[PDB]
Design a protein around this ligand. Sequence first.
Ligand code: COH
Length: 198
Amino acid sequence: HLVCPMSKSPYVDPHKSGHEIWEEFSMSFTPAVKEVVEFAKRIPGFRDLSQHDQVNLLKAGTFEVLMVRFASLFDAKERTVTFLSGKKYSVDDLHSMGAGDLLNSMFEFSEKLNALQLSDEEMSLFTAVVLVSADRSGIENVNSVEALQETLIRALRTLIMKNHPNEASIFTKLLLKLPDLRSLNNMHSEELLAFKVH
Ligand code: COH
């Protein structure tokens, strides 16, 4: 199976070669990836980073951006995951096909985030913060990346304070999701690389 909801379905044709499986999978996830590139380009300070650093932040952060953007695919009440085809699958069925601890963690994250009930403008600005908070391992101009992050974070504080004047803790709660996203990224990358088709 292929229990990633970026796929159209978790069922894999055992006659198809691995190259063929991956290529099919790629027609499903590539449009989502390109959408993160387009989004990055609309963060004004992102264009002022070095070309190398833009590419590196996208490299390290795309997953974390997509995890925020697709948190709603995880329905903690119904205990279902919606794949990009529109089809829904139960957690039990997905556990049976090889999902495990990482799926559970994703439900946990998604439930807490989905819960905060962010507006679109709030979610959008948070997502920008997530992107520019990506792992700095490849980065050549660290101070420029931290400056953009600080800029976006102040903007986020100002927006949450306008929209939630008596609940400033929402701001802090969002920042606390950054290490959680990094943990999800870490574990997911292990699953990605350990993926075999036969
Ligand atoms: C919204 C969450 C999300 C995103 C954005 C995402 C984005 C991407 C992505 C982006 C281009 C790629 C190449 C992959 C690639 C993979 N993902 Co995901 N995955 C995600 C959630 C998951 C989950 C959940 C699983 C199964 C985890 C588990 O518990 O086994 C997963 C599993 C996988 C697997 C292993 C499947 C298996 O062993 O059956 C691969 C490969 N992937 N994933």
